[PDB]
Amino acid sequence: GTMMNVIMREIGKKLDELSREFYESVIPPIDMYEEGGELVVVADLAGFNKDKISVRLSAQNELIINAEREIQYIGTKYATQRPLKIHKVIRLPVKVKRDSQVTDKYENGVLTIRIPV
Amino acid sequence: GPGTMMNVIMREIGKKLDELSREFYESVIPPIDMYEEGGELVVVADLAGFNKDKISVRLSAQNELIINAEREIQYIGTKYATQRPLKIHKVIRLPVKVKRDSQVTDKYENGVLTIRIPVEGSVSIRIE
Amino acid sequence: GPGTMMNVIMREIGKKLDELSREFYESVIPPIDMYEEGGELVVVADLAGFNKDKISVRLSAQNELIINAEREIQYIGTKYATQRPLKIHKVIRLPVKVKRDSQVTDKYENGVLTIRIPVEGSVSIRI
Amino acid sequence: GPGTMMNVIMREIGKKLDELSREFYESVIPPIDMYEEGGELVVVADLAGFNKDKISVRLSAQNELIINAEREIQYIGTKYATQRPLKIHKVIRLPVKVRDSQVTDKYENGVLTIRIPVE
Numbered sequence A: 001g002t003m004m005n006v007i008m009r010e011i012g013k014k015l016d017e018l019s020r021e022f023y024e025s026v027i028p029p030i031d032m033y034e035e036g037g038e039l040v041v042v043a044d045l046a047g048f049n050k051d052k053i054s055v056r057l058s059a060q061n062e063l064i065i066n067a068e069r070e071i072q073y074i075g076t077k078y079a080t081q082r083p084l085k086i087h088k089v090i091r092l093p094v095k096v097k098r099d100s101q102v103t104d105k106y107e108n109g110v111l112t113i114r115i116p117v
Numbered sequence B: 001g002p003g004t005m006m007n008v009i010m011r012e013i014g015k016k017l018d019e020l021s022r023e024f025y026e027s028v029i030p031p032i033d034m035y036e037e038g039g040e041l042v043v044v045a046d047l048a049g050f051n052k053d054k055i056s057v058r059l060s061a062q063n064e065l066i067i068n069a070e071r072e073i074q075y076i077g078t079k080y081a082t083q084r085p086l087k088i089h090k091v092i093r094l095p096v097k098v099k100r101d102s103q104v105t106d107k108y109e110n111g112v113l114t115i116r117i118p119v120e121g122s123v124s125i126r127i128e
Numbered sequence C: 001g002p003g004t005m006m007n008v009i010m011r012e013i014g015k016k017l018d019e020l021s022r023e024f025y026e027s028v029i030p031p032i033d034m035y036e037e038g039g040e041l042v043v044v045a046d047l048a049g050f051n052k053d054k055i056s057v058r059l060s061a062q063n064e065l066i067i068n069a070e071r072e073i074q075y076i077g078t079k080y081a082t083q084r085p086l087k088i089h090k091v092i093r094l095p096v097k098v099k100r101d102s103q104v105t106d107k108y109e110n111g112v113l114t115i116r117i118p119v120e121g122s123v124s125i126r127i
Numbered sequence D: 001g002p003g004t005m006m007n008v009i010m011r012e013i014g015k016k017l018d019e020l021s022r023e024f025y026e027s028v029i030p031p032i033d034m035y036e037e038g039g040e041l042v043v044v045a046d047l048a049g050f051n052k053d054k055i056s057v058r059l060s061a062q063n064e065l066i067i068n069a070e071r072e073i074q075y076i077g078t079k080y081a082t083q084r085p086l087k088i089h090k091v092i093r094l095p096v097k098v099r100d101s102q103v104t105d106k107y108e109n110g111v112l113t114i115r116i117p118v119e
């Protein structure tokens, strides 16, 4: 549910055995700043397909990042921490114009989003 | 009923875990997948936005894999959130015994670091 | 070896504790002094920045004192911290039985709330 | 230094909100509000029951803002609880950059309101 519950779930773990469920809550970390008249969001979101990443602006001034991937490995599996599904809701600091041109770029695993304000 | 400090503390922990800091991500990133097939151990790590030259992989004498990375991120203008990690030091305990002597391959594509490691199926050799 | 998650969580909570939430202070304000003098129980509460009409005081069936208080912080500007409480509900176990028949007096000055509660009591005898 | 607040809070684990220690409130009082309007930055702190003369504020080398206060409390009777803090030392990290400047404080209704002007 909450972050606290997510994080407390991992409380007795070593740092190399954190659950997938935890990374599905915590990924992606996000940088946010405003420069040149637009609001810029930057996400570390490695190893997804561009057609499998969705970005959304809510009525509620929330930025929603969605991503999905499938991962199947041949052989003996020892750790499967990399997240399959991502759902990141970001409340926006400053109001964004309803009609706007929004730019995004996905490179080197990094998702950069530019929203005019 | 006066209520308890315990609940107060719990409630406050919750608030503090609600938004997570860069230092927190520096300690948990990368998440890894780890699997063995055809006498190879593979580690796959989500490690977006680094330069190949700034990443290091080290195999220790304790059968551990060490992933290191560092970057600089420039912030201009008002900055509301700064979660993305600048420095990475992930220590992974390897599930199977691996051959330090043999050749280790890795690659870095789409933010994903992959490390292929030969597994010891024989008698171990130490070259030092 | 590999770090511990626990230490990470500890570190993460610890460094944020210098700034504590409004809800935390709504839980712990006010601190009180309590002492019996002159056949009445005296409760002294550090409760700054309230309007005297917004403070209310009650006495439970379970021999508790309840100190309620409410206020709104209007202040406009670019906020950096919001620690100060808005609503106060504090329930205090009273160490002696109160005479439920008697008038309770409360004074409020310098943010300090003083409450005097007449109590029931008798000289102890061992014949 | 760091982790001191953790220890302060964790010391009251297992207590009812009824019976929190003086030392707790000594570390935790006062709650503050911080916000900038105009050139000055205003700090509103709930610091009931002090004597204005006894209240001291300085600005630090590290640019932390320091609030000091001391007082005595008097009881005639049987004491059941003494939570109210006697000595207050609050170090506040300043968000805006500092250059020693004029500071204005007004202490009314137990509320300390201070204005600091930063460039």
Ligand SMILES: [Cl-]
Binding pocket: A064
């Ligand atoms: Cl959605």
Ligand SMILES: [Cl-]
Binding pocket: B058, B066
């Ligand atoms: Cl190392």
Ligand SMILES: [Cl-]
Binding pocket: none
């Ligand atoms: Cl000093």
